[PDB]
């Protein structure tokens, strides 16, 4: 009988548990597992580049739990008056409900969809909440998304900061249920990159080992990084930080004697693992960008792709508003993103190439080789 | 000042227009756009995989709305009780609301978020709604998902079916704003290959054109179909249809003399553009496959890549419970799936190579070929 009762209306956050799939994503190979602490480092991230955050701590508790410690402003705790009970509850039990959905609060943060973490929460055994703000320190716990009693004062402090331990179910998450160090310090060096004077410490309870990233240098830095292990062809690093349009576009570049092409991109800080509209103006920008430099200087044919070989690359951009196809973020599906970079782009990097003839004449002769060796394998394929 | 006051809750479908990245996808390239078409498309099509739909007429109104009418149960219309307005109603303005968080309104389907009609419902300018069920045809209208009034009674009729017509939000869509009439039309020529008896129209009252999609074979067909403009190598395309241990997985294939690989993934019949669990698990067991039998064979070396040229596939999977990382159903992220197809490839597979050796020598032949060309390309890089 399909009728009206047939009709089942999911509240709270039952639907994250009922479909993870759509909030954290994979709960078998450990990618989701791992989303929901990253969840709460973006939160304390966008702290962060609000200007009031400047240490986070992450660590790996014996027992299989994570905590994160921000000193940021401390997730509101006042009674929230249409909903009834205090600010931080309405923030960790209701979905679509938070601070970035204007921009008075966070001028610019990686969340945007009121959603992160409530999933933690959602999709936790148990969530530990410790809230430092106004002199007093606030705590609460949840189990299964379910407060145990309203947030309460537990005592004094001179300090501001967000503290979230949480303890993933294993009704939610299969197969991969502990956390691998590797995978969060890969994402926390990241970050380190991304967010110069930003202190982020990361700690194994079970093993004693930690690491301390504060790297300076920036962007740039992470290329040099990125590159280490592998051979630069040519010293000058192309680098630059706009902000024109409402759009920050900061892009740092450097080719090596290697073949594969690593593009990283970023909006907001948060990675897009599938790439989008910022990564398809890059594309087309450095290659309309090296074509009439080429062209110009009488070295023309090459496609995007051979200049794409040996290229490392990382894309950060800021925006105010930006969309993604989903709530893990791995891909930008904003069109006025791929403009500004692709303008910035063919901008800046023009400049360098002028700017940078020993250089340019390097990766020049590299997109060259490129394509004289993707000519080679495409006649050898023809004639077996 | 960052307080309890900065804390925002989006209600009803407010989140919808404000993040609709996460929702729809793409508002600009006109991904989303058609994307709008395939949520009620899909809402029907589940209906057809319940058995109670055998006709669905979609039609490119010339004032760009588009409609979708099945044949089908029709939307429940009774008061829900809880919510105290029609059914209807509910599914339309709710998120995570709907008959599909359990098995007994529909065993299978594509749809199991509460999302999909409430997301195009949010995004439209207008919304017509209209139910034949239970002796009697029902209306209601939504402005930008707003009802203007109760669900209403409007005739008499024998028949059911459900018939949803939207106008689109172009404060929402941008740049491509006009439905594509070849879009439409591969994706319901699509299903209809997924859904053999189920009669599918498509109708442009813009220029007259329409496409009447009732192709039988199935599966099977989709294969002859795909491979229609390409040279099939071997006769016998591979097929197979299954359901264990809860899941359906159904499969066809065979080889072109072409040298690329398109696998068409499915769950539930809804595409997965960026594949998953099925398609890993297909890939698996191809490879363990024609491994095995190229060893006992004495042809034994070729990789997964070299099997994967020329291949056209396609893997549909029946599931009762998929897991997708998104409400666009790009990637299925339910492990379990990757075992149900890689065990019943590796069985029917291995089975057809016995079956069929003419087809099956000629399988292996093109894989050395490949192996050989691929070889010979990385030599040909490797010498410039
Ligand atoms: N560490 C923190 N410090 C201060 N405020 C925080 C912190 N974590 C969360 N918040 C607040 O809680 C709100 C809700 O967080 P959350 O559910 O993660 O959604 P979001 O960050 O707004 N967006 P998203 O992560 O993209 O879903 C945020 O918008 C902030 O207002
Ligand atoms: N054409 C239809 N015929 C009958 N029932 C329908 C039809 N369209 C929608 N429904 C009902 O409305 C509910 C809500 O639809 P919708 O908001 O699309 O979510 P869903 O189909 O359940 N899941 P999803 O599409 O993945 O978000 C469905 O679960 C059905 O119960
Ligand atoms: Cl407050
Ligand atoms: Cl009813
Ligand atoms: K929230
Ligand atoms: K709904
Ligand atoms: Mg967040
Ligand atoms: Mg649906
Ligand atoms: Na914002
Ligand atoms: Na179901």
Chains 1, 2 share one sequence.
């Not at 410490?201 to 920036?218: P, Q, S, V």
Request: aromatic share 8%; with cysteine; proline share 3%.
């Amino acid at each position: 009988s399909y009728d009206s009762s047939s009709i089942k209306v999911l509240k709270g956050l039952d639907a994250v548990r009922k479909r993870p799939g759509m909030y954290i994503g994979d709960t078998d190979d450990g990618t989701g597992l791992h989303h929901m602490v990253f969840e709460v480092v973006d939160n304390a991230i966008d702290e962060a580049l609000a200007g009031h955050c400047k240490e986070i701590i992450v660590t790996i508790h014996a027992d299989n739990s994570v905590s994160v410690q921000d000193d940021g402003r401390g997730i509101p705790t006042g009674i929230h008056p249409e909903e009834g009970v205090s600010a931080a509850e309405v923030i960790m039990t209701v979905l679509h409900a938070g601070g970035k959905f204007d921009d008075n609060s966070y001028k610019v943060s990686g969340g945007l969809h009121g959603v992160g973490v409530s999933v933690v929460n959602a999709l936790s055994q148990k969530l530990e909440l410790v809230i430092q703000r106004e002199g007093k320190i606030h705590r609460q716990i949840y189990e299964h998304g379910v407060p145990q009693a309203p947030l309460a004062v537990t005592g004094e402090t001179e300090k501001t900061g967000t503290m979230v331990r949480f303890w993933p179910s294993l009704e939610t998450f299969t197969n991969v249920t502990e956390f691998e160090y590797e995978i969060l310090a890969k994402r926390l060096r990241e970050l380190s990159f991304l967010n110069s004077g930003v202190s982020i410490r990361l700690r194994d309870k079970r093993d004693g080992k930690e690491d301390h990233f504060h790297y300076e240098g920036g962007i740039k830095a992470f290329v040099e990084y990125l590159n280490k292990n592998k051979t630069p062809i040519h010293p000058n690093i192309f680098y630059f930080s706009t902000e024109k349009d409402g759009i920050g576009v900061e892009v740092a570049l450097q080719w090596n004697d290697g073949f594969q092409e690593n593009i990283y991109c970023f909006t907001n800080n948060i990675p897009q693992r599938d790439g989008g509209t910022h990564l398809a103006g890059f594309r087309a920008a450095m290659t309309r960008t090296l074509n009439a430099y080429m062209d110009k200087e009488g070295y023309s044919s090459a496609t995007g792709d051979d200049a794409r070989e040996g290229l490392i690359a990382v894309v950060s951009v800021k925006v105010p508003d930006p969309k993604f196809s989903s709530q893990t973020k791995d891909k930008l599906v904003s069109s006025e993103v791929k403009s500004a970079v692709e303008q910035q782009m063919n901008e800046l990097l023009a400049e360098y190439l002028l700017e940078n003839p020993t250089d340019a004449k390097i990766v020049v002769g590299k997109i060259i080789d490129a394509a004289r060796a993707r000519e080679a394998a495409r006649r050898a394929r023809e004639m077996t």
